[PDB]
Each structure stands twice: as C-alpha cells, then as structure tokens.
Design a protein around this motif. Structure first.
Motif: not given
Lengths: 211, 213, 115
Positions: A136, A161-163, A172-174
């Motif tokens: 985050n 996944s990147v915001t 933010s990234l997952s």
C-alpha cells in the motif's frame, strides 16, 4: 504494416514542467501522424493531426512536431487535468496506433506498507491455496516483489495487480501466489520480498505455516 | 451536435456471434466514412474495419478478416459490425468512429460498447476471509476469488467501515475468472474484540455474501 | 423533370465521393458550407460554379456530365459566383471533398423531398 513505437509506457512529471512524449514509425509516414488523449472511462480525444495541427478547442500548451519517422508530442507546461494516456497513430497507410504513454505525477518517494496473508482454511477445503502479499501507498511505481517458498524463488503461479496513481500520488499493488492445497501443505516458510527505491534494503515479510 | 451511440455488446462464448450497431445523429451520415476501433483490457487501441459512404469499399484489420463484416444502412443512419467466430482476444470496448476518407484520423468517437468473449459462464465469487497471521493497528482482508464477469463491489461492515479500506484491481485468471483482494487497517483495540465483515456483491450473478473475519 | 435529373446525377455523385474516399488519405475537415442545395428548386446556379472550378482537379468526364445535367435546371441565365479554390494542397483536397459530400447530401435531401 507500419509499427508505431512509444518507448515509454509511463512517464513521471511535475505540474509546471515540460513533457516530451516520443513516437517512432518503422517506415516513413511523412507528417501523417495523429495524437490522442484518453482519460479513464472515456473514448480517446483527438489532439493533433498532420503531426502539428492542433484540433479545434485543444489548449495551446499541447503541440506536435516531427516529420518522417520520429515524432514528438509536447506539453509546454503540464496542468493537473493533463494526467492521462497519450497515443500516436499514423495514417500514411492502414491505421496503426502506438501503445500509449501514461503521464503520472512525480512526488517524494514513499515506503510501502506491506501485509502478508496465509490461505484461509475455507479455501484449502476446495483444493487451492492463495498466499496474498499486499503493498500500500508507495512511490515510485517501479517495484520488485519476489516470492520464496522454503528459500526457493517462485517463477510460476503469481499474479500481480497494480493500482492507478491514487489521490495522493502513491501506488498500491497486490501479488498472489496460488498453488494446490496439497502443495501448500508440503512447505513451511512463505516469504514475500520487496525491493524498492524507498527501501535501503529489501523488506522481507514471511510466515511459518506450522504456527 | 455529432453523436455516435453504439449498442449490442454482451457476453459470449468462443465461436459465438454478435452484431454491433452504431446509430449516428447530427450530420448527414451518408457523407462520411465510418469505422470501428476497439480497445482491449490492456488498453491498446486497434483499428478494426472501415466502410465508404455507400458501402462500395471496405478495409479490415487482419486479425478479424473472414470473421467480421462491416456494413451500413444509410436510411437508418446505422453502422453495423457483424462478428462471427468470436475468440477470447476479441474482448474489448468497440467504438464506432467517423472519418473523412478511408485512411485518416478519428475526430469523432462514440462512448463504446463492451464485448466480452470467454469460455467461462457467469460465476459467483467465493469470498475467503483473511485474518491476521499485537500492534497499534492490524490488517484484515478478503480474497474475492474466481468470478465472472466483472465487476464486484466490496464494502466493509456493510459500508460503515470506509477509512483505511484498500481494494485492489481485479486480475484475470487462465480459467477466465477474475479475482481481487480487499483489505482494511483498523486500530488494534478494535480487534479481535469486535467482529469485522466484508460484504461482496456480484451484480451479474445477483449474489450477496457477508463473510466475517 | 426534377426527379429525372436527380436520378441521373446520383450515381455520378456517389461514385465521385466514394472514389475520393478511397484514393485520398488524411483529408482534413473544412467545416465550410460551399453548396447551397435549394433556391424552391435545386440550385444549379449556386452549385455549378463549384463544379466548374474543380473540373481541372477531378475527372473531367464525370464533371462534364454533372454540368450538363445541372445546366438544364438553370431556369434563367442567373449569374454564377466566381469561386476561389484554395491553393494549399490540403485545403484544396478538403475543398473538393466538401463539394462532393454536400452534393451527395443535397441530392439525397431533394430525393426525400420527392417521395
């Protein structure tokens, strides 16, 4: 077929700065180049045609130059509403588009807040196991997230996944590592390893399955 | 004012067909070349097809040749795209556009119509609560696993918990199903003494899940 | 016979427009009104000068046919404006394209008037 190459997928700039977005064609197209701006949820909007003609109502800070194969789209002074994706397009021959360059706002570097979650027992029932590493509010966008299971680097089963740049200009990234539940149950130490410009050394988040 | 309005986009299986329409207003439709342009989920733009004023000349991008057919009915100010033999990579927003000649730029665009091609039928998400693995704050999360088509909406404690919520963009899995995670950070006093719930709504499957963490 | 001249002109006008769309790349929109469709009858004296002025730039044979048709609908020796064709190459193509587009539209409009 004429290939249009926009070398930079993203460029950081600051409000008030000059911006130079480049586009290069595989063959001579002369001046038969168009530039488009696109905002999320909207169709692309024509800005420049014949490489340098500004379309009606387009603000004067936008301009285009070049002829032949090398073209430049320039914003003389970036304004906040100019954060968008810009595409070139040639019309010397059958239409082709460059791949787009996304302008985002430069800010001070910011360290990620990192969280790691073990597969839930309900998911394991079904035969799958997703281990979830969430990052985050970091800047800059470029970040390296590495997965290690019992010390061995994972090179499969990973989705990222990147915001989009959020309201205070951070990202933010997952990252999610998915395997079968039997496979997950056969390993002990799961680590998500974060390399980033704002971190003087790699940040390791890990858990021990057997707890 | 020049207006282009597309319709017909929908969810289909590979090998299926679909017909797009674009109805134009504000200009003499038969005076202009019309075209389709599509934008795939990764946001690359690809010109699709073009038709002259009275249909005598058409061009197609190679990827769609022999599967798509562009046509027009000037009496109804309507452009069509007949799409046969659809494939997953045809998934895109399809825009209809107006041009002066057959090879030009695109000064007028519609708002676009979404076409989704997937071997997945509509699928309800599985919602997995992710509890912490002591502190000033703790992080709770929900994995929203395997749904189709987009989107889901995620809220926390039926909308009362909004500060500190971070929902990530969905990713598309090889199965054709989408997944995303949502997390929240709460003051540590509030856990585990309170109950937290993530509320997932999947409109397309018309399903509602509340999962406590 | 107004209806007869429209049907005579229509395939000439459609062909000229569609061939221009196929041959010419990147023609900009002029946004100008050039042809006045009506006077009310079809306005040969307003349309003719434009076709006379693009004749050296277009297919002389089809233009000649168009002019012969429109002369029949000039119910007098009404006077003909002298037309300034743009010298710049892109302006000149936009000028021709706009003439072909508006001629097409005029005929289609008058044809709907007749049905």
């Amino acid at each position: 077929e004429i290939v249009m190459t926009q070398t930079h997928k993203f460029m950081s700039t600051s409000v008030g700065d000059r911006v130079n977005i480049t586009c290069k064609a595989s063959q001579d197209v002369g001046a038969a180049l168009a530039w488009y701006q696109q905002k999320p949820g909207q169709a692309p909007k024509l800005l420049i045609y014949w490489a340098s003609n500004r379309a009606t109502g387009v603000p004067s800070r936008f301009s285009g130059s070049g002829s032949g194969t090398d073209f430049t789209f320039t914003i003389s002074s970036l304004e906040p509403e100019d954060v968008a994706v810009y595409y070139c397009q040639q019309f010397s021959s059958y239409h082709t588009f460059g791949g787009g360059t996304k302008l985002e706002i430069k800010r001070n570097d910011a360290q990620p807040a990192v969280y790691l979650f073990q597969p839930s027992p309900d998911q394991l029932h079904t035969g799958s196991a997703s281990v979830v590493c969430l990052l985050n509010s970091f800047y800059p966008k470029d970040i390296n997230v590495k997965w290690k299971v019992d010390g061995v680097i994972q090179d499969t089963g990973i989705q990222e996944s990147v915001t989009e740049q959020d309201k205070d200009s951070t990202y933010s990234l997952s990252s999610t590592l998915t395997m079968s539940s039997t496979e997950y149950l056969s390993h002990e130490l799961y680590s998500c390893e974060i390399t980033h410009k704002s971190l003087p050394s790699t940040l390791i988040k890990s858990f021990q399955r057997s707890e | 004012e020049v207006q282009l309005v597309e319709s017909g986009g929908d969810l289909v299986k590979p090998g299926g067909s679909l017909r797009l329409s674009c109805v134009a207003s504000g200009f003499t439709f038969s005076s202009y070349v019309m075209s389709w342009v599509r934008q795939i989920p990764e946001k690359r733009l690809e010109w699709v097809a073009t038709i002259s004023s009275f249909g005598s000349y058409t061009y197609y991008v190679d990827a769609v040749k022999g599967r798509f057919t562009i046509s027009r009915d000037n009496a109804k100010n309507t452009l069509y795209l007949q799409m046969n033999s659809l494939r997953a990579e045809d998934t895109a927003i399809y825009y209809c556009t107006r041009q002066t000649t057959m090879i030009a730029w695109f000064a007028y665009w519609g708002q676009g119509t979404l076409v989704t091609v997937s071997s997945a039928s509509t699928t309800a998400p599985s919602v997995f609560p992710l509890a912490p693995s002591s502190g000033s704050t703790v992080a709770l999360a929900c994995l929203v696993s395997g749904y189709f088509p987009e989107p889901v909406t995620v809220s926390w404690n039926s909308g009362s918990l909004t500060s500190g919520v971070h929902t990530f963009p969905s990713v598309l899995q090889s199965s054709g199903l989408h997944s995303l995670s949502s997390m929240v950070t709460v003051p540590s006093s509030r856990w585990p003494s309170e109950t937290f719930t993530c509320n997932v709504v999947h409109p397309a499957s018309n399903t509602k899940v509340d999962k406590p963490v | 016979d107004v209806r007869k001249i429209i049907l005579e002109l229509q395939p000439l006008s459609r062909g000229l427009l569609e061939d221009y769309q196929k041959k010419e790349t990147g023609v900009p929109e002029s946004n100008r009104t050039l042809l006045l469709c009506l006077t009310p009858r079809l306005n040969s004296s307003a349309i003719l000068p434009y076709f006379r002025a693009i004749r050296p730039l277009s297919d002389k044979n089809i233009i000649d046919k168009i002019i012969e048709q429109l002369d029949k609908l000039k119910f007098q020796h009404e006077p003909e404006t002298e037309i300034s064709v743009p010298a710049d190459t892109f302006e000149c193509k936009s000028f021709i394209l706009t003439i072909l587009q508006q001629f097409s539209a005029c005929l289609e409009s008058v044809f709907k008037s007749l049905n």
